[PDB]
Design a protein around this ligand. Structure first.
Ligand SMILES: CCCCCCCCCCCCCCCCCC(=O)OC[C@H](COP(=O)(O)OCCN)OC(=O)CCCCCCCCCCCCCCCCC
Ligand SMILES: CCCCCCCCCCCCCCCCCC(=O)OC[C@H](COP(=O)(O)OCCN)OC(=O)CCCCCCCCCCCCCCCCC
Ligand SMILES: CCCCCCCCCCCCCCCCCC(=O)OC[C@H](COP(=O)(O)OCCN)OC(=O)CCCCCCCCCCCCCCCCC
Ligand SMILES: CCCCCCCCCCCCCCCCCC(=O)OC[C@H](COP(=O)(O)OCCN)OC(=O)CCCCCCCCCCCCCCCCC
Ligand SMILES: CCCCCCCCCCCCCCCCCC(=O)OC[C@H](COP(=O)(O)OCCN)OC(=O)CCCCCCCCCCCCCCCCC
Ligand SMILES: CCCCCCCCCCCCCCCCCC(=O)OC[C@H](COP(=O)(O)OCCN)OC(=O)CCCCCCCCCCCCCCCCC
Ligand SMILES: O=P(O)(O)O[C@H]1[C@H](OP(=O)(O)O)[C@@H](OP(=O)(O)O)[C@@H](OP(=O)(O)O)[C@H](OP(=O)(O)O)[C@H]1OP(=O)(O)O
Ligand SMILES: O=P(O)(O)O[C@H]1[C@H](OP(=O)(O)O)[C@@H](OP(=O)(O)O)[C@@H](OP(=O)(O)O)[C@H](OP(=O)(O)O)[C@H]1OP(=O)(O)O
Ligand SMILES: CC(C)CCC[C@@H](C)[C@H]1CC[C@H]2[C@@H]3CC=C4C[C@@H](O)CC[C@]4(C)[C@H]3CC[C@]12C
Ligand SMILES: CC(C)CCC[C@@H](C)[C@H]1CC[C@H]2[C@@H]3CC=C4C[C@@H](O)CC[C@]4(C)[C@H]3CC[C@]12C
Ligand SMILES: CC(C)CCC[C@@H](C)[C@H]1CC[C@H]2[C@@H]3CC=C4C[C@@H](O)CC[C@]4(C)[C@H]3CC[C@]12C
Ligand SMILES: CC(C)CCC[C@@H](C)[C@H]1CC[C@H]2[C@@H]3CC=C4C[C@@H](O)CC[C@]4(C)[C@H]3CC[C@]12C
Ligand SMILES: CC(C)CCC[C@@H](C)[C@H]1CC[C@H]2[C@@H]3CC=C4C[C@@H](O)CC[C@]4(C)[C@H]3CC[C@]12C
Ligand SMILES: CC(C)CCC[C@@H](C)[C@H]1CC[C@H]2[C@@H]3CC=C4C[C@@H](O)CC[C@]4(C)[C@H]3CC[C@]12C
Ligand SMILES: CC(C)CCC[C@@H](C)[C@H]1CC[C@H]2[C@@H]3CC=C4C[C@@H](O)CC[C@]4(C)[C@H]3CC[C@]12C
Ligand SMILES: CC(C)CCC[C@@H](C)[C@H]1CC[C@H]2[C@@H]3CC=C4C[C@@H](O)CC[C@]4(C)[C@H]3CC[C@]12C
Ligand SMILES: CCCCCCCCCCCCCCCC(=O)O
Ligand SMILES: CCCCCCCCCCCCCCCC(=O)O
Lengths: 606, 609
């Protein structure tokens, strides 16, 4: 799209006559491409003459429009400071009239109407300032784009555009800060939240509502998913066979359910960030022009939910009666992976390719610098470890447990489980669960070796490394219970000895390094930090309590399982707790990204 | 909303200091509203003095706003004519540059770039002209609203004589020259710049009305559509598998066909209003709807999907028979009862304005002779002509729940046997006949009233014949059926008449559709073969396909009378009728698209005159 159509789409005609006429230069460039001769048509010396002309005429035209853009941004910055002076005098007059209502009622009612009217006045003035940054940054991007199209110029953009007064003058940016500092101290008399609520203008080309077609698709997918889920519940209640164990099916489909729930919660998270003002575009280093809003994620979440409901429903009662049952769980995940890769330039190709790059960089953790996106994804994998181990179990079941001859082999004939796949034997289960905590450990050590700062890159390393010992002790306990040694219970102690640590280690951390709460300076925000982006502190306290509970939720599992001795209690509690784990990650994302935006806690961009 | 907040929604802030600052006057009214003394507080003569001072002070304030807005529109209209002259100079200079490529390539490419750029120039010129029309009519309604609010508060009528004697003669309203300025813009663009494309770019959809519906309503439309689709599929599967194959499902089909027709009609009406809005046919003026707030296509898709969901659920509950203690014959009654309740809900929720407007329209239509027929009344009374099967199904359901259903049996909705012998589904007593002729009676009486009101024997009496043919059509059909029941010879002699009138009614109401409703086959055709001079919709293939579709569908019974008399299937007639009813609603949906266009263009109904 070459930053040509969407650029004109988000261009206001009011200043369009003096923006970088990118479309006009496109027309000139293609039209003069149409008259490119060959070696025989014009001699090589004349070819060099033609190319030298082309390049120098393009560069002098660029110089002319460069001078035009500098002239406009100089006059408009003089206008911006003149408007600063005028609006400052008007706000001083409003403050004097406030003193006429404070230090010395129809008059007071008129004065607060005037206060709100000037509030709207600096709102549209902030909009004009946003238009001026549009001028600046879109001019920069158009310069780069047209010049690199000509090149396909570099020392020209650097030696003209990067030093031109139309981008070297970052004061307009801090002028926006003035518009901030003028408001909060004078308009709101010290209220930051209402300021950022009113004056902060969402981008017209990015934060605009998504097309009604995408919202309709989201609604259609959500409705189909709801009805399919209801039909699935009824099918389980009635049409499901009660004489066969349904555990392999649950274990196979628990990963897909956890992934779809995660995508839906991530859509909610990105909506929350966008509304609260946390510019995750900069934090994630995403493309400012085109990015996935919350609806574009709800769409994929609903589509995959429909896909999972249909697959599970076909697994419940066979519709074809000639196709074996296991084909549905195989095909669902197979074409989910296909949709993930999808080499063709369709179905969110930009975001899918970006995610594929991120996954490749994360998985090969030690040999790559850790950005915020990489750390964030390798942390998200920590709470989605159930998906990885469930995929491992599905592979094991399809390899060494499933009977390919029997059509209804997915649901075992017997109601008892004795296969190797769901056991901790050989340590395979232990290893596939420690993968997410291995990537984070390696990434933390890489950050330490890249910044030579022992803190917090080494405390993070210990926090991530506790799970190694915890899982190892759990595996030893399971094996020694299988064999029945005297040391068995001893290993159990070590599990509980380390588990209560590996939760506390990830509980004093989530509340202090990630969420930044319990700050030394609190003031009005009890137990919180100085600045709270989100509206109500009740959300903050609910998040604290929820994380405190969910980091120890394993206590309930280890309490019921070791006491009640139900026919099948461990699997039930694990399957119940996995969605709670994903919910905990969803809650954590809000406050982690907010703190990263505010205090730059990760020291990523510095 | 008192035309205050939604008004503030559609107000460009750049002229906000120039319109009537309605909120300000709302504040001044509320001031002295809290400053109104009593008889004991101030004596009666002083009460009159205070009230008269209030009248005079709002009156000179209204005079000040009158003068300010008059001066602003005078300045803006002088600016508009200077802009018109200057843009005419620019556009004729573009004509000269065009002649450079025509009478006197990079130059031609640049010329068409300036052509598209100037097209944009008059795009925002049209936007500014529309803003001036806003300055006119929205401010007009602003004075209307503020003065009438003051009148109600102060129990006076001097505000009415003020608006009539100041605003109605004010230069800012009497000067309709800005509307003819838009007219000149359109004429110049059509003649010089470019009809279909000219009315496509210049015509700016209203910012407060045609703006896309909130995403929280498009989402609801999607949710309802998806639930409906899945429920529809589950219902088909339940019919294929879980439906009992020993009983006759005919009473259920007949009871539940009416709701399906109504929901399909509402969905097709949503499609129709989207088509009118996109094609540029303003249905707001023609239908006499409120320009500010009206139902867009999504607001109708929402109700259609919701009612489809409810119908599908009711049919499913009648199918699976859950709870196991509530009988099967409660679900259709509950569904139709709640539909009626939702139509007549008195609370100010769920499209209260639209529902009250529809209630008024239905009351005016059904008491046909006593009310002057507008376009809305004629249109609604015409819509029932293709929805008569719903009225027939409601009559059948009434008869079934009264005289044939067994209240003792739980599974009484589906009869024990597989044969039908009840009176309800027959033509006996003419109850199935008079119910069929109700929409025709309403239309016939409405058009006779139209004649008695305009004294123009045409086309108010030819249309009366069109709506009266079906009287003889139903009379002969019912009499033939009754005489065939007994077996008298004359029944055969009567049958001819039915078929005879079948080719005298469907023909008669065909030449009407293609000539006086749609207005095609006009004497002046030109390039538009078989069509009228000006066509709004893009492709003429749509028009020809519509002609073929209407020709086929107005003659539907030809197939039915061809099949039920040949195969002699035990239940061919009911199957064919149930198949044809949705086709009948589709034929009405197609007819609307072109009837409204012709009414907009040629004022064929002669309604607004
Ligand atoms: C046993 C049966 C159980 C069945 C459960 C199956 C799952 C049910 C799923 C429920 C619906 C999920 C999606 C609902 C929200 C859809 C959002 C959407 O697409 O609309 C956009 C919405 C409004 O648009 P606006 O904010 O004006 O524009 C923003 C510009 N980008 O803008 C927004 O995005 C903001 C508002 C929506 C986001 C906040 C609320 C999200 C949903 C909260 C949970 C709802 C219930 C979830 C499932 C039940 C479990 C609790
Ligand atoms: C495989 C291991 C199993 C464990 C789980 C691992 C995968 C979890 C799901 C993916 C991670 C969550 C989504 C990550 C993106 C979040 C970032 C965000 O808020 O913005 C969305 C992002 C923006 O991208 P954008 O700015 O449009 O790109 C412009 C490029 N110039 O755009 C995005 O949305 C980026 C992500 C791609 C698009 C949405 C996700 C598609 C996933 C398809 C299904 C995956 C199935 C995996 C197989 C499971 C089998 C068990
Ligand atoms: C991705 C994988 C590939 C796709 C897989 C196929 C699609 C999903 C699975 C559809 C399954 C449909 C049902 C198949 C029935 C097979 C036979 C059977 O066991 O019947 C179920 C039961 C039997 O009742 P019985 O009285 O024994 O019938 C006697 C027959 N004369 O009968 C009953 O209980 C009644 C039947 C109820 C069926 C409800 C099914 C609802 C969902 C269907 C699909 C909806 C999709 C909608 C969304 C699509 C996207 C727009
Ligand atoms: C045996 C199983 C059988 C299965 C059958 C089940 C029933 C099928 C039900 C299908 C329902 C589809 C209707 C839902 C469409 C709603 C679309 C919508 O609301 O989108 C908004 C759309 C674009 O909006 P925009 O122009 O951006 O802005 C408008 C300014 N306010 O604005 C619009 O509304 C305009 C564009 C959409 C409307 C025109 C096309 C809609 C209908 C297409 C056909 C649908 C299928 C019909 C059923 C099949 C039989 C033929
Ligand atoms: C009883 C006899 C049965 C035979 C059928 C008779 C009823 C058929 C359905 C109603 C007729 C179709 C609706 C006609 C609308 C035509 C105008 C149009 O396109 O605009 C929609 C109109 C605009 O209204 P608006 O401008 O918002 O309000 C004006 C004041 N501000 O707003 C509208 O949409 C107006 C209509 C009201 C809202 C939608 C319809 C709700 C009705 C609920 C279901 C009706 C159930 C009837 C009983 C059936 C039992 C068998
Ligand atoms: C407004 C009206 C009043 C309210 C209406 C109530 C809701 C609509 C009716 C729901 C009916 C649910 C099914 C009830 C079944 C009762 C038992 C029965 O006859 O079952 C039939 C079939 C075979 O059962 P069988 O195998 O014999 O059972 C053995 C017992 N262990 O067993 C089966 O049913 C097979 C499983 C398929 C069930 C498909 C049901 C799909 C629809 C459910 C509702 C969806 C609503 C979603 C939208 C809500 C809005 C968001
Ligand atoms: O839409 P995209 O896939 O992101 O590609 C477009 C555009 O592709 P097209 O040539 O097909 O229009 C190209 O614009 P130019 O720089 O060549 O003028 C270029 O991508 P390619 O050259 O590889 O095709 C560019 O860069 P990128 O793909 O890295 O984003 C990008 O345009 P935008 O950066 O403005 O989106
Ligand atoms: O929302 P609506 O039902 O259309 O009513 C509003 C508004 O009602 P509210 O007082 O509740 O805001 C009133 O505006 P005022 O004339 O009092 O300023 C008045 O209706 P009521 O007095 O009966 O409540 C008026 O008339 P109507 O309801 O007939 O339309 C109408 O305002 P609009 O005419 O601008 O729509
Ligand atoms: C993550 C996604 C791709 C799900 C993984 C599915 C694929 C990769 C896995 C799951 C089950 C697997 C099969 C399980 C068992 C056997 C039998 C063995 O003798 C040859 C390999 C073969 C045939 C495997 C091939 C790969 C396989 C199809
Ligand atoms: C560098 C340090 C801190 C981390 C190294 C992590 C690796 C080497 C650890 C983490 C989890 C461990 C496994 C946990 C459980 C089992 C099962 C047991 O019956 C044999 C050992 C075995 C298979 C362990 C092997 C080593 C292991 C894979
Ligand atoms: C008390 C414990 C057990 C449960 C409560 C935790 C849950 C329900 C709370 C804690 C954090 C909360 C979120 C915090 C902030 C926001 C942003 C706001 O714009 C919308 C609500 C939203 C998205 C909240 C939704 C509810 C939420 C997820
Ligand atoms: C209206 C929307 C929510 C869909 C309706 C779904 C719920 C309310 C329906 C669908 C399936 C129904 C159940 C189906 C079967 C039985 C068995 C018997 O004991 C009667 C009640 C009972 C237990 C029903 C109660 C209501 C029920 C649970
Ligand atoms: C158009 C909408 C309202 C649907 C019509 C439903 C209502 C009006 C109809 C449907 C069936 C009807 C019932 C059918 C049969 C009888 C038995 C008779 O001895 C008294 C009246 C009574 C009890 C009727 C009352 C009205 C009734 C409940
Ligand atoms: C004014 C004229 C032109 C139109 C009047 C239409 C009315 C009066 C007509 C139209 C349909 C007619 C009915 C059609 C069929 C039957 C059944 C028959 O067994 C007795 C007469 C009866 C019940 C008719 C009575 C009169 C009727 C109701
Ligand atoms: C083939 C014959 C027998 C029957 C088919 C008729 C149907 C499919 C045709 C006839 C009239 C047509 C409509 C006429 C005009 C419009 C308005 C336009 O903006 C979108 C398409 C739309 C909405 C058409 C859709 C298709 C349509 C409904
Ligand atoms: C005007 C143009 C389209 C001609 C229309 C012809 C139609 C209306 C005519 C011509 C032939 C006719 C059919 C000829 C023969 C019979 C057999 C008789 O036992 C019942 C009526 C029936 C089935 C007629 C029904 C009406 C009919 C189909
Ligand atoms: C499964 C049946 C679906 C019926 C309705 C489908 C509605 C969505 C069709 C999408 C077509 C592509 C249009 C994309 C336009 C956009 O995203 O702006
Ligand atoms: C049947 C369950 C539905 C669950 C999801 C419901 C989504 C819509 C809920 C609307 C809440 C109120 C907001 C209405 C806003 C509006 O009027 O546009």
């Amino acid at each position: 799209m070459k930053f040509a159509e969407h650029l004109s789409a988000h261009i206001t005609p009011e200043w369009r006559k003096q923006y970088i006429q990118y479309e006009a230069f496109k027309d000139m460039l293609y039209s003069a491409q149409d008259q490119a001769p060959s070696v025989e048509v014009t001699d090589e010396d004349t070819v060099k003459r033609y190319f030298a002309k082309f390049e120098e005429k393009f560069f002098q035209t660029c110089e002319k429009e460069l001078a035009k853009i500098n002239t406009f941004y100089s006059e408009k910055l003089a206008e911006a400071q003149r408007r600063f002076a005028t609006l400052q005098n008007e706000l001083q007059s409003s403050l004097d009239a406030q003193k006429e209502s404070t230090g010395v009622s129809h008059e007071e009612r008129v004065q607060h109407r005037n206060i709100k009217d000037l509030k709207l006045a600096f709102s549209e003035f902030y909009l004009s300032l946003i238009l001026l940054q549009n001028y600046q940054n879109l001019n920069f991007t158009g310069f780069r784009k047209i010049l690199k199209k000509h090149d396909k110029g570099a020392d020209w953009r650097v030696a003209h555009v990067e030093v031109a007064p139309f981008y070297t003058c970052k004061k307009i940016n801090q002028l926006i800060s003035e518009t901030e500092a003028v408001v909060t101290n004078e308009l709101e008399d010290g209220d930051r939240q209402k300021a950022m609520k009113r004056l902060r203008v969402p981008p017209l080309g990015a934060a605009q509502p998504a097309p009604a077609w995408t919202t309709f698709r989201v609604g259609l997918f959500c409705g189909i998913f709801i009805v399919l889920n209801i039909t699935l519940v009824l099918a389980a209640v009635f049409k499901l066979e009660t004489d066969r164990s349904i555990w392999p099916l649950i274990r196979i489909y628990r990963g897909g359910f956890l992934l779809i729930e995660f995508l839906f919660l991530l859509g909610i998270n990105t909506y929350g960030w966008r509304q609260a003002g946390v510019n995750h575009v900069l934090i994630f280093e995403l493309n400012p022009r085109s990015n996935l809003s919350h609806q574009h994620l709800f769409e994929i979440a609903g589509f995959l939910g429909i896909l999972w409901c249909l697959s599970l429903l076909a697994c419940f009662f066979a519709p074809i009666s000639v196709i074996p049952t296991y084909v549905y769980p195989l095909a669902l995940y197979g074409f989910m992976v296909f949709f993930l890769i999808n080499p063709t330039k369709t179905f969110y190709y930009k975001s899918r390719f970006w995610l594929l790059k991120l996954l490749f960089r994360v998985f090969t953790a030690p040999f790559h610098k850790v950005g915020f996106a990489d750390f964030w994804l390798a942390d998200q994998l920590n709470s989605l470890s159930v998906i990885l181990m469930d995929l491992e179990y599905m592979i094991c079941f399809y390899s060494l447990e499933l009977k390919w001859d029997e059509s209804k082999g997915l649901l075992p004939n017997n109601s008892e489980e004795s296969g190797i796949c769901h056991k901790y034997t050989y340590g395979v289960r232990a290893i596939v669960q420690c993968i997410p905590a291995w990537l984070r450990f390696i990434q933390c050590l890489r950050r330490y070796r890249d910044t030579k700062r022992a803190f917090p890159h080494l405390v993070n390393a210990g926090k991530y490394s506790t799970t190694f010992f915890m899982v190892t002790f759990a595996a030893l306990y399971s094996t020694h219970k299988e064999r029945g040694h005297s040391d068995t219970m001893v290993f159990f102690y070590l599990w509980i000895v380390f588990y209560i640590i590996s939760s506390c280690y990830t509980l004093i951390w989530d509340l202090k390094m990630d969420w930044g709460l319990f700050d030394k300076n609190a003031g009005e925000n009890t137990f919180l930090r100085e600045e709270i982006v989100y509206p109500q502190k009740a959300y903050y306290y609910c998040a604290i309590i929820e994380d405190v509970i969910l980091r120890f939720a394993w206590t309930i599992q280890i309490s019921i399982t070791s006491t009640t001795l139900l026919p099948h209690s461990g699997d039930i509690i694990a399957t119940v707790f996995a969605p709670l784990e994903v919910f905990r990650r969803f809650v954590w994302n809000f406050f982690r990204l907010e703190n990263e935006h505010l205090n730059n806690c990760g020291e990523f961009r510095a």
